[PDB]
UniProtKB/Swiss-Prot annotation, chain A:
Component of the RNA polymerase I (Pol I), RNA polymerase II (Pol II) and RNA polymerase III (Pol III) complexes. Component of the RNA polymerase I (Pol I) complex consisting of 14 subunits: RPA135, RPA190, RPC40, RPA14, RPB5, RPO26, RPA43, RPB8, RPA12, RPB10, RPC19, RPC10, RPA49 and RPA34. The complex is composed of a horseshoe-shaped core containing ten subunits (RPA135, RPA190, RPB5, RPO26, RPB8, RPB10, RPC10, RPA12, RPC19 and RPC40) where RPA135 and RPA190 form the DNA-binding cleft. It comes from the Eukaryota. The chain holds residues 109 to 215 of 215 of the full protein. DNA-dependent RNA polymerases catalyze the transcription of DNA into RNA using the four ribonucleoside triphosphates as substrates. Common component of RNA polymerases I, II and III which synthesize ribosomal RNA precursors, mRNA precursors and many functional non-coding RNAs, and small RNAs, such as 5S rRNA and tRNAs, respectively. Pol II is the central component of the basal RNA polymerase II transcription machinery. RNA polymerase complexes are composed of mobile elements that move relative to each other. It is found in: Nucleus. It comes from Saccharomyces cerevisiae (strain ATCC 204508 / S288c) (Baker's yeast). The gene is RPB5. This is DNA-directed RNA polymerases I, II, and III subunit RPABC1. Belongs to the archaeal Rpo5/eukaryotic RPB5 RNA polymerase subunit family.
UniProtKB/Swiss-Prot annotation, chain B:
Residues 1236-1311 are annotated as: Disordered. This is DNA-directed RNA polymerase I subunit RPA190. The gene is RPA190. Zn(2+) 1 binds at residues 59, 62, 69, 72. It is found in: Nucleus, Nucleolus. It comes from Saccharomyces cerevisiae (strain ATCC 204508 / S288c). The keyword Zinc applies. Residues 1286-1307 have a biased composition (Basic and acidic residues).
From Swiss-Prot, chain C:
Component of the RNA polymerase I (Pol I) complex consisting of 14 subunits: RPA135, RPA190, RPC40, RPA14, RPB5, RPO26, RPA43, RPB8, RPA12, RPB10, RPC19, RPC10, RPA49 and RPA34. The complex is composed of a horseshoe-shaped core containing ten subunits (RPA135, RPA190, RPB5, RPO26, RPB8, RPB10, RPC10, RPA12, RPC19 and RPC40) where RPA135 and RPA190 form the DNA-binding cleft. Outside of the core, RPA14 and RPA43 form the stalk that mediates interactions with transcription initiation factors and newly synthesized RNA. It comes from the Eukaryota. Three distinct zinc-containing RNA polymerases are found in eukaryotic nuclei: polymerase I for the ribosomal RNA precursor, polymerase II for the mRNA precursor, and polymerase III for 5S and tRNA genes. Present with 14100 molecules/cell in log phase SD medium. The lineage of its organism: Eukaryota, Fungi, Dikarya, Ascomycota, Saccharomycotina. Coiled coil: none annotated. A zinc finger (C4-type) spans 15-42. This is DNA-directed RNA polymerase I subunit RPA135. DNA-dependent RNA polymerases catalyze the transcription of DNA into RNA using the four ribonucleoside triphosphates as substrates. Component of RNA polymerase I (Pol I) which synthesizes ribosomal RNA precursors. Besides, RNA polymerase I has intrinsic RNA cleavage activity. RPA190 and RPA135 both contribute to the polymerase catalytic activity and together form the Pol I active center. In addition, subunit RPA12 contributes a catalytic zinc ribbon that is required for RNA cleavage by Pol I. It comes from Saccharomyces cerevisiae (strain ATCC 204508 / S288c). Disulfide bonds: none annotated. Signal peptide: none annotated. The gene is RPA135.
Amino acid sequence: IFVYQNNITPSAMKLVPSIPPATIETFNEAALVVNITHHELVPKHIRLSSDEKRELLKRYRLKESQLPRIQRADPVALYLGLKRGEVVKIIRKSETSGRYASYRICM
Amino acid sequence: ISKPVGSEITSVDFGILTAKIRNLSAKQITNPTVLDNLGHPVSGGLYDLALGAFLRNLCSTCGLDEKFCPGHQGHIELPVPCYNPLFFNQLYIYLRASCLFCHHFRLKSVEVHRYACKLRLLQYGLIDESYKLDEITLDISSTLLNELKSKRSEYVDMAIAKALSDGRTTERGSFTATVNDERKKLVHEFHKKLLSRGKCDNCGMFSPKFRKDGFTKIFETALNEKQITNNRVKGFIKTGSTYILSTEVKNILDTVFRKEQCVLQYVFHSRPNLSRKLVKADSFFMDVLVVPPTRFRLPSKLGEEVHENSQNQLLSKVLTTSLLIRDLNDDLSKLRVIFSRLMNAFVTIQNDVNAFIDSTKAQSGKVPIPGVKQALEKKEGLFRKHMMGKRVNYAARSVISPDPNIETNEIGVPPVFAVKLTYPEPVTAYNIAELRQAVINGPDKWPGATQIQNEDGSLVSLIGMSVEQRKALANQLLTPSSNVSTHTLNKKVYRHIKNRDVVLMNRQPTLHKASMMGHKVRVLPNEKTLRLHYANTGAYNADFDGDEMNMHFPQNENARAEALNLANTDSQYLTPTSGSPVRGLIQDHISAGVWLTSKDSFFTREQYQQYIYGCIRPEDGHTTRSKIVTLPPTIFKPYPLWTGKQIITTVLLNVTPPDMPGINLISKNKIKNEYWGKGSLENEVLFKDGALLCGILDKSQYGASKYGIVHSLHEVYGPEVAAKVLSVLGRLFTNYITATAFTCGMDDLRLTAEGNKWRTDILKTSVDTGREAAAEVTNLDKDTPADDPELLKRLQEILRDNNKSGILDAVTSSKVNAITSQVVSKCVPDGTMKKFPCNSMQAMALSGAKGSNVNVSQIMCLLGQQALEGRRVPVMVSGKTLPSFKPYETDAMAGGYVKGRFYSGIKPQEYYFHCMAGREGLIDTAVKTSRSGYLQRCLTKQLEGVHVSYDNSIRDADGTLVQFMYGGDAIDITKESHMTQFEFCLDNYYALLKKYNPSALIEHLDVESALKYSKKTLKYRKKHSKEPHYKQSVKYDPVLAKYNPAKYLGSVSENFQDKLESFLDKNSKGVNEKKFRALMQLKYMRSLINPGEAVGIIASQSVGEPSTQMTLNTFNVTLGIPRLREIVMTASAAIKTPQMTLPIWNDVSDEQADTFCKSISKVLLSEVIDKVIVTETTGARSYVIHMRFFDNNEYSEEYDVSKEELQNVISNQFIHLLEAAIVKEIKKQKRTTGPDIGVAVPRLQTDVANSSSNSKRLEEDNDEEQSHKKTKQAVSYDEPDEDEIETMREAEKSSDEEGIDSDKESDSDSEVEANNNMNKVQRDRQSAIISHHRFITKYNFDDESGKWCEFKLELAADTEKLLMVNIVEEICRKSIIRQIPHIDRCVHPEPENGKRVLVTEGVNFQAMWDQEAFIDVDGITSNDVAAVLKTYGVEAARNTIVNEINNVFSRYAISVSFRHLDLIADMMTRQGTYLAFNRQGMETSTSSFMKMSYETTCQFLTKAVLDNEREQLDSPSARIVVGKLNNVGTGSFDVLAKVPNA
Amino acid sequence: DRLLNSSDYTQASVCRECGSILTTQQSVPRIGSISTVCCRRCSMRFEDAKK
């Protein structure tokens, strides 16, 4: 994680995929003043290992691209550090039912 | 139905006709003659007899006749390949991007190889592997770039073989919306890198860039003077835009497409290519046309005048030109002018096939000939007029009429309709007795028939026959015909519509599904109109004054079963929007139950037996006991009498089933107890074992009202018992009204003499109210008189302002509305002449029969304040509200307070003001119409295949999952009505136990499992009760997420679970608590949403229908439908009024919070200036600017702005703007000072189009304009007249290579007091202020008091007069003192329910995070959804959508369910972005017939062909086109018959 | 019923090889035969009897 202050050079933005095993995740420290997962409108995102991604897709009989999608540059997908093809689990409080578990894949 | 179909269409491939059309139709058309003299079809013409039979000639191809031939196609041999105007825009990309020398593209062959190899990955179900191709990257020699290509194709050959080894793809590929999202993102990028390059990267020699014109000519420019020097240092090792012939461009793009076959194999395919056919260039070029068959090109006709067709008119012009360009090619064959007509003939042979396909993309007199593209794209055309909107047989329409003597689930059919509409009834062994009588009666006498169908397929009409032939033909129905081909079939008598059929019945604006219900048929004699019950008038929303309803009569048993079980009126009792009942008795049945169930109502014995059999008749099947049972009387000894509440007991005793016990209900009336007298209890309704024991019945009980008696019988005994009670009470209070009438007279309206004495004296106290308010607003006192001249000066001051004078119109309105409610509160119950039961005027308001207490007050007491546009009566320029009043008359009556009443009359002055308030509602009559018409259509095209699956998930038609449960808990809205009404269920336990019968039910569903897991999750949640939501440990996901609710007993949402615990714990009441859980957890299981349910349509109708109810104006925040057009439609990144709710802390105080609002709210420098005194003098033009601020103790309270900040804005921002405005204005002085006199300027006041709305239809009154919208289906608007539709019409600009690339301009050619005695500081501050500005030359600032500022701009002497004060007033209103960005003004409103919050006019989340000492930053709430998406992610953007749709509905007191709002917000955020319902949102979708049928039809059509798409035929808009059965509901499964033999 | 079985509803013929509606035809039979339905662009004229 490379926390910076004003900017990283566009010449230096090419060094992010420069390591194919290892990732570099850059955050501007003005965007880190408030942890956005503590906000009332943001539910509990939990990321699923493939031992239960696969058991999710076996219950509902889903291809991976038929799930609801979360973006690669979402403020909570960048928080958890989601690679593409990783299902995150959302437990949100419905007005009707209370705690309601929903799922969403990163593509 | 006796002709079954086997094979059926399952999927539809798009494609291009190759020029081998010559196989299917070589009947080619060369003669441009259509008919000769003496009317024959000429051979080789456009009406040839090999194209199908025509004018009673036979077909030369079929051999069949005028009717039976299907028609045949024919081609027109173009001698040259002129291109296609559909695929032209998408070859002009491929022509600009190719190198003509190298015969490749301009890009690198490996950059093309990258995109060619990612699109191979996207056509399978794998996307992350298509981003891992960019991670293969290792002045480059040729042996490295051919190995880089080898290892990228190495990975893909393993990436596909890995996934196809699993089930993640098939050999036919996979294709979803998110897969189609990424493919559009590469191909649009691949068509942007290729469009802009300089040289070919595989050679040097580069082609000159083309430029086109209106789709007919291709021009190639001459390569300019700099670039040939590149062509001769690399290649060696006429005029502007010469013409390029159409055979050159094929020859160019043939060797381009042959060379890069590898990339184009994956641009023109979104699924894998399985035929491996080559993408060729003659797909873009048209060697031949085809001609539609003659049946599709018949002549047009008006009266006797039979004109020539549109299609033949265009198609002959091509065929004359083709013969010309053939004949003139013979002319040039013997060798100038002949070369200039041939090249001009190529312009017009292209231009006439461009005319054959398009109309606007050709040239036209005023309105040219329609092309085949423009026959498709509007509300009219083809794809919405004749594919979604067909006209039907077996239907009728008529005016409807009221009827209380029919059942509520019935329609009364006239005998005019009844002897026309016929149903094919196959004759069998059980119906020959009733179908012989049908053939005997014939088509005149009603229970008869019209025609019989033989076993061979032919019909035999019975119309002209007599009773001889008809009786001799009824006796032959069960006779087998001798044939063996038809030994299975039997005959079909087309009997008339009897009393046992059903009918779809259709009010014409069908805004929701209860506007089209299924009635039973009752054929009534002697009538000419359809005839309907009053209980159905709320469902269709009908008023019985000339409404026409369509009567659709379905024609098979798969539709009779579904109009009797699914779309009947008995199942439509509760609406799906909130679960409220929409069926009940309306006006005069309400006002008879208040008399019948009253306590005066005693009936004798002969009267008791008559009213029971007047409403309940055992022959029709109303009783359940086959014999009317009665009750003992309530009075025995003096004379036997029955009470009126005992008749209601009796009619409930007979219609309810005898096994189930009576209803137990405790409720309320609308009628207060004190209207009956001392100690009366006739407000509490009490049913105890099916017996009305207390309290009258009203609109609150058997109206369309929730938790009444009819709504309770629907829950305990079901929909058919509650249907019969509205039928029985509809006839009980009709026969009671006949025997005992009801009237409204003049004595019902008069006050008594004491009560009429009260309202004179209470209104005597309002003669001195208009001046007490007028002296309050002007801040005078001690009751200044009305004609005091200082008051009259002040009232004229508040006459000239609009933010004032609503102050006076809100003080004086409230100060006279108190006198209004003092007269009502003392008179209308107590000062009336006739008290409650006998006063039918009050009894129609208290019952809810018709009217209100407001209507009764304006009749008996006074009209009151007639308020206009929210304010009050408008005033003249002279201070007079009428010519009868003194100017500035301080009076209530002069301001429009009507003290008169409708009983006694309103005076001519106050008659006039009530005519003003009568008109201001009537301007909101015409603006109601086309508000929500387009909004609901745009919802119902996206939420249209969305349906419950059998695993309770909410999925779109293509399978792309939207939700995992409906609402969170999979409950139908029309079932959760008594689900939390636990007190009602405990009273009715034994009656509700054998509705939800658990004895024959428990061995099919698991009992012990989800009860065990729920008590884990319940107790574990009770541990971490005070932990916040982000610290909630997630060991135990909810029980619905693990167990099927319809299969496991006890798997229940965590909100129903807690309410059931909180009822059983706080209440101690032969019923245990174990057997009340096991019923209320069975009631939950039997109240679930069924699979196949069309929850997409229901959610889109439950939003769009009550938005026909919020069309009204202000009684700040964007209100109603234009707020709903921003959320649901158009996906507004820029809301016109964005806000931000900032919750302040608990320990911050109100003084600390108002001071905080001042710190955020922006302060213009205009806001702290009182006066600016500019003394201009000359000699150099020495302008002196003196500013007078307000006092420092004032603007430091009002704005929290220190006087040092005024120094730090004037000296550093103001004068930089001031001297910029001056040198701009002196530059205007030298350059532009005078126009050209005599030259006309353009137009003045016309609009952009049509110069008016309508020249004739704009003067149609609402009784005449509803006469033109009743006789035809005319609910649509052609131009829906919206700026957001115009902003949906205006966006998405052409190019960055346009005339202006970044909106570039010139930006060039610039090159009192008398004080002195400053200190050294202010002298030296001034020195660098002069030295850093251009004209200052003197400066000072009042630092001791902060009251003034002063400087002396001394300009040039050459300059002339200049309006300096208007320069200053602009700059002061723009100079910001203190603005936090994107935020204008904060304010501290009055709290709703303990939430101390702020409201911020603007959205800036990033800046409010640094104010955590006052604001809870973990609780701030916006309505800008595109800002919550950008900052807090996609789930907080989702919860903002459901919260901001709910503000639109709860403001109008409309309660939609949250289950409908959750399904829309999950559809708008299904991509992780904020998409709306529009063309741009619809783009990422699977089915193309949904896209073509919405709008921009041939836009999506060319997209579907260039994609070479297979249509999977699963959206419902694609199944109706191809005629396939829809699969939402009863089409969502297959029925299979069990046969016994092997 | 209200959009197919009452409005238009033809039982058309469709070739199962080219997958097209409008390329079909009932033949003119030689005088002994019964006419049958036969496609056109899947057809080959009898002159093409080549080896």
